[PDB]
Amino acid sequence: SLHHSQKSFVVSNQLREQQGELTSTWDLMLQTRINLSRSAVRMMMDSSNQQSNAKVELLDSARKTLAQAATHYKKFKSMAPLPEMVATSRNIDEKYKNYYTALTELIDYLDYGNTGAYFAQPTQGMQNAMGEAFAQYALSSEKLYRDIVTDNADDYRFAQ
Amino acid sequence: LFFSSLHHSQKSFVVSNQLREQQGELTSTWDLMLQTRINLSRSAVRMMMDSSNQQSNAKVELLDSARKTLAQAATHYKKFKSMAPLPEMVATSRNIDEKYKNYYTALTELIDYLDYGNTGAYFAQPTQGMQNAMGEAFAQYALSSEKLYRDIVTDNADDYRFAQ
Numbered sequence: 001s002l003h004h005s006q007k008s009f010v011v012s013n014q015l016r017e018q019q020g021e022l023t024s025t026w027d028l029m030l031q032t033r034i035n036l037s038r039s040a041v042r043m044m045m046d047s048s049n050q051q052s053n054a055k056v057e058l059l060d061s062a063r064k065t066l067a068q069a070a071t072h073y074k075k076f077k078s079m080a081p082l083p084e085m086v087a088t089s090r091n092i093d094e095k096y097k098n099y100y101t102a103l104t105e106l107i108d109y110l111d112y113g114n115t116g117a118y119f120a121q122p123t124q125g126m127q128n129a130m131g132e133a134f135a136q137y138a139l140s141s142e143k144l145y146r147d148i149v150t151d152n153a154d155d156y157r158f159a160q
Numbered sequence: 161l162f163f164s165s166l167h168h169s170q171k172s173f174v175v176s177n178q179l180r181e182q183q184g185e186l187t188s189t190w191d192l193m194l195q196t197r198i199n200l201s202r203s204a205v206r207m208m209m210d211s212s213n214q215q216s217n218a219k220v221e222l223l224d225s226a227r228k229t230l231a232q233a234a235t236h237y238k239k240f241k242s243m244a245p246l247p248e249m250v251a252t253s254r255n256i257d258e259k260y261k262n263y264y265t266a267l268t269e270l271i272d273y274l275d276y277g278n279t280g281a282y283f284a285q286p287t288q289g290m291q292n293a294m295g296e297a298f299a300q301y302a303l304s305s306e307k308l309y310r311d312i313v314t315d316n317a318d319d320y321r322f323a324q
């Protein structure tokens with residue numbers, strides 16, 4: 001009961017910050033995928049094309065976005081989930097790790113000139129599974145957020 | 161009212177909630193623009209392949225998927241625009257608009273090039289810089305939004321009025 005307003009401001013700030021860190025992680029993972037495909041385009045070009053020499057710079061740019069993604073994901077993990085958010089957090093964890101590993105595999109395939117393995121990987125499915133996990137998380141987070149900011153949440157939900 | 165601790169007036173909740181919904185619809189827009197870029201690049205690389213490579217057969221399906229995701233991006237962006245800005249957000253919203261139209265148009269031109277396999281025109285477009293600019297505008301909008309949101313919820317009069 002005591003200090004309810006202050007606890008509501010801190011928890012609502014946390015839920016927004018957690019969503020923001022997941023947003024950053026998703027966008028950087030998509031950017032990784034983009035940079036990988038740009039590197040693959042250079043590898044498929046003939047040498048005479050000015051843009052073909054950039055294959056390594058482009059693959060390094062994918063490694064950079066992927067590390068940035070993982071940094072934001074770490075930041076997300078640094079904010080303790082609220083009780084009703086635990087399961088959807090753990091679902092993100094599972095799907096994130098799968099997609100992260102997929103992307104690291106794609107980097108390795110291009111680094112070794114294995115363009116066939118690169119195109120064969122079912123990357124889209126892994127992305128879509130993480131996207132679905134993000135959507136479930138967002139639904140849960142928004143239900144909690146609406147209850148907190150409208151004084152319709154019992155104390156147990158705020159880890160009070 | 162008391163409506164709630166954070167929003168003494170339920171009108172404050174309307175305003176603050178708008179702000180969040182606007183962010184949400186811009187986040188969606190950006191997501192789907194990036195998905196469009198992915199689908200385009202995955203199409204374009206397959207247009208560089210030999211016909212005999214079985215991986216080339218998806219090039220059209222992927223370009224169709226770009227068209228789908230770009231349409232969805234534009235739907236979200238219209239939703240964003242449908243929500244009246246607060247006056248403190250007008251400037252950053254106009255900045256988003258500038259960068260969004262630049263990148264959107266770029267993506268539509270890429271779809272048009274790939275439609276007949278014009279990989280040269282696709283490559284020559286300086287797409288990355290337009291994407292990067294949109295991403296920076298998005299970041300800036302998000303910073304501004306969050307700061308304003310905190311101002312509203314901690315100000316607590318009732319009080320904030322949408323721009324006309």
Ligand SMILES: N[C@@H](CC(=O)O)C(=O)O
Pocket residue numbers: 033037106118119120121122123124202205
């Ligand atoms: N499998 C990779 C490369 C591709 O198929 O173009 C991806 O989906 O990003």
